[PDB]
Amino acid sequence: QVEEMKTQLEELEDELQAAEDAKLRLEVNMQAMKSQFERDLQARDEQN
């Protein structure tokens, strides 16, 4: 049972690391969306 719980906890740690990596990636992609939004907004304002 100790061995089983060790395997399960290591799997959950791996999944947690994957989830944190995904969170960081989603954050940086949201910053990309924000950057594009600002750039396009400024382009439309300058064209106007």
Q: Which residues bind other proteins (CB under 8 A)?
A: 10-11, 13-14, 17-18, 21, 25, 27-29, 31-32, 34-35, 39
Give the nearest distance from C-beta 2 to other proteins in angstroms: 19
Q: CB of residue 5 vs other proteins: minimum separation in angstroms?
A: 16
Distance of closest approach, residue 17 Cβ to other proteins, in angstroms: 7
Rounded CA separation 14/9 (Å): 9
Q: Measured between alpha carbons, how far is residue 41 from residues 9, 20, 21, 48 in Å?
A: 47, 31, 30, 11
